[PDB]
Write a protein that binds this ligand. Structure first.
Ligand code: CPL
Ligand code: CPL
Ligand code: PIO
Ligand code: PIO
Ligand code: ERG
Ligand code: ERG
Ligand code: ERG
Ligand code: ERG
Lengths: 604, 604
């Protein structure tokens, strides 16, 4: 909340400028500070509970801080006592200002090296511009001063300490945007670290520093981590045979693997870690050997199942209508057969076998799609475009509509045409889910997805506004006319549908040249042809062209992300005997229990 | 196979780390090596059959290699004895690591300079990252160390030696990606070469180094080869008159010429050699003087032949139907005349003359197109887009359909409309083959080809999926309705055709405003108008626009490649008296039997 933080900062500045000691410490006024510290409070606090030493350390005044530490040195151990800054000692502010002399003086005076800055300003939030952690070692690692890190570690800072989110100092080091010096600081902290190692300590969410580097899109820290796990077997000429380790990449026998955390991430940059050196090799092996033929087999089985469903839909049992067509505008000549009237002939028995196959396929689809929602969460399963969220919504709706059609068929309920048409359209449009397995058809589904949940939802309000206005105009111009001669605008729903058809130029303009149409229709339809047909439609065509160009710029990255997501899904759902553990065995060749991957690269 | 090569490498590293001698040679451990070589095997081998000297040479340990060569020097002549590395001595690994001292020590010890590295890793394959050949001189030329080349040649390496593919050292030099230093290495090896020259030695495929440089897209080596064949007549001011040699470019009196090998190549870069200095001049002379008027004459003759075929198709003999139209939905009022009933009047005799002209043209087309398939191969004749593969398929199908129509006409078989329509469409669409002879119409055929075998085959699966789903929905919504009022969806093939028409907006939406259509048709057609008409169609429009832009970026190169392919085809197929040998005579002007080409260029 910005209006509370501004009030806190203004009250802090008012309390600094009101007290003479805080004002003398702020401006580095040595004379007034010496006068006030010669004789008379040393423990007066501002609006945020900060002492005079915090004010002296905030404005980088070393001499005023030494003068304030000459008398009553316990201010080195006094933390702030207010909500936006809880526990912020002078050491944190001295480290953040990167003043080595003030940090050395505070550690000589005996400041707490394990004091936690548990305020609201130090938490990880979009309100806070920086997440530097809570312990002063985290601040010293994130700022980028190695001397302060060595001085804090030699004075007894704990490298294994965790903040309120559970993040260790490596986790807060990974999250920094300055990823160049952060690798050197990571190497320094790993050198100073000698139970389990600091690399295997997870946070409260459950992520290791390797997995957190994978999630947050930190490619440089990912390369720095993987350069400590490779093993160059031989470098012969331009050929180099590296042996990468898949212990923290494959994550075999785990609830959530590394690649599933990488792909199902809100950060955009994480897909770049699907283009790194061991990960791309690993997913290419797992896709070309196992993922692609199993995905093609599943696609062929689903296509045959949809063909059986379509064949059961076309041969739906219909009989002659018993009631006579009294209304001249009624064209219903057939109605649905009853349950006793149907399933008599042998062709109806073949249809019954096909319908049993269809309903068992729908039950299998529901049993395969429902527990993943409870496992991974409803917001992430239906939300991610790469994972196939809309396809999961479509296939769950299709299975529910097939079950609803079964219920309506067993209970002799008329009106199966509506769920059968819904199920046919959704089930056939869910065949395009299996187009992600091919590079020639992969990004096209993403193009249609970004044109439907993108430009279509951003232009349908303007389209519906124009449709409503011109449909109302076309209805009231033809309210006083004979509906037989021009019945395109006779009822307001039919006027809305006719104008929606005329927007996309899929029907002709209504014209009857043997009768006198009203002139207001002519002027209003000229306006509709200019504004809606010509101008606003071809704006949407250009928006779709820009969306197609935007996806086609990054088609390979998006198809690779779809490949990794499909490979992770097929490794998780299919049984283990169809998916052996990828990589070299390792134990057979005299090495440990780790599973390795050999990459031969052509350098120089 | 990667899973075998990884197993071989891991077994090799395990056998290195198991034996103490191989481990001492790997780590350059002098103490353990001296202890093991003082007293006790010197001939122990690893998983790939490599000796200890191969391990010492693989890790660039010169001192350990000299210690291993001090005792039992026969390890300098010991090759590996396993399948992925056959015959790989220590000299090949010493040359690949570019260690001149180790190569000199191995040649002093008496290593085999003609040992062949006939393993699977040294062959030319997409599995292997490098193709450096088999003989150590090929390795020394490909790595780029002139001192090793001179040391191997002075010790007795054969420059004329060929590997399993028949490639000499020049062939393996051309295939390298580092084409800058490869020209200098080529010049050094030609200087050291003093029967026929090394430039005229072909491989097992039949290609000279000039032809292999032409095929593989190596433009820099092509310039380096052509700078040894030019002859500057006079340089006056800014004008330079060079006299290029067409002995290895024109290839007169040969089964496969140089330009036919350049154009009909799987490599993309070979078309750049159609833009070089003598080749572009030569094909421009051969096209502007001979190829263009002969191609225009053939185009005019084929257009007149297709006009005669169309005129015979329009005047096809038809008589009144003998059977009465019993079915009210039947509109057949004419049927085909019999063979005895036809060919009676004088106009039928004119039609008979035209049909004889048509069938002789089809026989001529078959006799001109069939033996080229057996000559150049079915995979290359119908495969290359530049050569006109689809046009050859179309014209062979057209000739076969004309012959089938002749067979059905002679045997009084009804149903000539189907092969006549097939032959008319294919024969008229084969007129666009003759559009490659004009720069204003050249790349347009390539645009249509890349939009048909490209984006159309990559989008027709999604299009057919949407067509099948919405056709099934529109059929089952109108299964219970009267087919007289709205017969666009009455049968499932007719529903498929009507939805395919509604996809491309070539017919209107089915609407009958005098009767009550079902509302599910209205919602499903609104969905079809949004998803299929508006979104997915204009995605294909944008894909075709991107394909058109991609071809229009490189229109001149593609048209030049079409010109060279057409010129080669017309030089091969037409008789020799219409195609004199291009270039200056040479023998008349006191020079040799070579045929030259004069190029005047404006330098500076
Ligand atoms: C989203 C796009 C379109 C919305 C479609 C809504 C269906 C309306 C048909 C109602 C009907 O059912 O129509 C009428 C009901 O009163 C109406 O006029 C509807 C009045 C309101 C319609 C306009 C607002 C629609 C919702 C707007 C939402 C915000 C969108 C813009 C901002 C982004 C039934 O009477 P009738 O047409 O059979 O006869 C004609 C009358 N006599 C008997 C005298 C001949
Ligand atoms: C490629 C694009 C389109 C394929 C066209 C295939 C022609 C189908 C017409 C059959 C017929 O002949 O139709 C029906 C036969 O049973 C059917 O429904 C066909 C069932 C299967 C159709 C859908 C699958 C087609 C092939 C899919 C291949 C994979 C493509 C997607 C993946 C990329 C003949 O009965 P009917 O229509 O005359 O009367 C209607 C029935 N009463 C008598 C009760 C009124
Ligand atoms: C029947 C289907 C139901 C699907 C329901 C669930 C649908 C579902 O799974 O995604 C919903 C969508 C997700 O976002 P969306 O599809 O727009 O795409 C993501 C993101 O929102 C941006 O739009 C994308 O970048 P840009 O802005 O294009 O540059 C970004 O690309 P990248 O940077 O990550 O690479 C994407 O990650 O959010 C909505 O807008 C709701 C519209 C709902 C409209 C329909 C409501 C029924
Ligand atoms: C009736 C006609 C029959 C023709 C049969 C034979 C047709 C025939 O001769 O070419 C077939 C085609 C060749 O490849 P295609 O036409 O796509 O074009 C080549 C290549 O495959 C790439 O597509 C092109 O680059 P890009 O990817 O565009 O960037 C490349 O350009 P360049 O880099 O070389 O400059 C081209 O050399 O391969 C198929 O995909 C089969 C589709 C068959 C579909 C239809 C099957 C009946
Ligand atoms: C049955 C009729 C009445 C209406 C409701 C039908 C709507 C269908 C055609 C629409 C609704 C949402 C659309 C839709 C949702 C999301 C996606 C995921 C995207 O990555 C590819 C396109 C795809 C798969 C499309 C396909 C067509 C769908 C499924
Ligand atoms: C992009 C915009 C323009 C799209 C979303 C607008 C949708 C509206 C205008 C369309 C979509 C489906 C149409 C529709 C659905 C079904 C029926 C029932 C039918 O008996 C009368 C027409 C009627 C009532 C029309 C009214 C207009 C609707 C609701
Ligand atoms: C007769 C009807 C029923 C159907 C089969 C006809 C198909 C024709 C129109 C289609 C089939 C394949 C198409 C086709 C094949 C390939 C090429 C080569 C390309 O470089 C230019 C376009 C061109 C020449 C086009 C022309 C139109 C063709 C020949
Ligand atoms: C790009 C996609 C959408 C293209 C290739 C799809 C093709 C399908 C949908 C089209 C192409 C030709 C069409 C076609 C050919 C001929 C006939 C015979 C006629 O008596 C009934 C319609 C029927 C049976 C239709 C069915 C639908 C077909 C097969």
């Amino acid at each position: 909340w910005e209006q509370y933080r501004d009030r806190v900062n203004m009250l802090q500045q008012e309390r600094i400028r009101d007290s003479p000691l805080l004002q003398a410490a702020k401006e580095n006024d040595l004379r007034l500070l010496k006068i006030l510290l010669l004789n008379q409070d040393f423990q007066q606090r501002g609006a945020v509970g900060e002492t005079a030493l915090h004010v002296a350390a905030l404005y980088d005044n070393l001499e005023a801080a030494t003068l304030l530490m000459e008398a009553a040195p316990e201010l080195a151990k006094e933390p702030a006592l207010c909500e936006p800054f809880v526990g912020q000692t002078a050491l944190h502010i001295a480290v953040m200002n990167q003043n080595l002399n003030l940090v050395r003086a505070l550690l000589a005076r005996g400041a707490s090296v394990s004091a936690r800055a548990t305020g609201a300003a130090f938490r990880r939030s979009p309100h806070n511009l920086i997440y530097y952690g809570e312990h002063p070692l985290s601040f010293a690692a994130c700022v980028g001063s190695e001397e302060i890190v060595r001085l804090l570690i030699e004075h007894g800072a704990d490298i294994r300490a965790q903040d309120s989110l559970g993040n260790t100092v490596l986790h807060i080091l990974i999250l920094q945007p300055n990823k160049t010096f952060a690798c050197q600081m990571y190497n320094l902290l790993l050198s100073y670290d000698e139970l389990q190692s600091l690399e295997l300590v997870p946070n409260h969410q459950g992520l290791t520093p390797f997995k957190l580097a994978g999630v947050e899109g930190n490619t440089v820290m990912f390369q720095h981590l993987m350069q400590k796990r490779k093993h160059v077997q031989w470098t012969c000429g331009p050929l180099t045979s590296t042996l990468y380790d898949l212990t923290e990449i494959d994550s075999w026998g785990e609830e959530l693997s590394f690649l599933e955390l990488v792909v199902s991430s809100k950060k955009r940059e994480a897909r770049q870690i699907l283009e790194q050196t061991p990960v791309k090799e690993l997913v290419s092996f797992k896709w070309k050997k196992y993922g692609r033929p199993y995905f093609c087999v599943l696609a062929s089985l689903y296509i045959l199942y949809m063909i059986c469903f379509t064949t059961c839909c076309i041969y739906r049992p219909l009989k002659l209508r018993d009631d006579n067509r009294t209304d001249p505008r009624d064209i219903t000549i057939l109605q649905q057969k009853l349950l006793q009237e149907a399933y008599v002939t042998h062709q109806d028995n073949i249809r019954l076998v096909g319908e049993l196959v269809t309903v068992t396929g729908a039950v299998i689809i529901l049993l395969l799609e429902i527990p993943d929602i409870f496992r991974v969460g409803a917001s992430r399963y239906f939300g991610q475009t790469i994972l196939g969220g809309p396809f999961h919504v479509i296939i769950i709706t299709y299975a529910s509509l097939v079950l609803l059609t079964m219920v309506m068929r067993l209970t002799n309920m008329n009106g199966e045409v509506v769920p059968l048409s819904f199920a046919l359209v959704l089930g056939w449009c869910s065949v395009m889910y299996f187009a992600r397995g091919f590079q020639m058809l992969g990004p096209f589904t993403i193009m249609i997805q970004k044109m439907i949940f993108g430009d279509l939802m951003r232009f349908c309000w303007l389209m519906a506004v124009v449709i409503l206005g011109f449909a109302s105009a076309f209805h009231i111009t033809f309210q006083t006319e004979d509906p037989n001669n021009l019945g395109e605008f006779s009822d307001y729903p039919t006027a809305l549908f006719s104008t929606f058809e005329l927007f996309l130029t899929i029907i002709d303009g209504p014209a009857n040249y043997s009768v006198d149409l009203p002139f207001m229709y002519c002027i209003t339809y000229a306006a509709f042809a200019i504004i809606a047909t010509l101008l606003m439609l071809n704006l949407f065509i250009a928006m779709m062209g820009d969306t197609h160009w935007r996806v086609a710029q990054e088609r390979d990255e998006l198809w690779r992300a779809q490949v990794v997501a499909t490979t992770v899904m097929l490794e998780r759902k299919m049984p283990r005997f169809l998916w052996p553990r990828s990589g070299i065995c390792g134990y057979e060749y005299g090495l440990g229990d780790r599973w390795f991957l050999r990459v031969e690269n052509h350098h120089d």
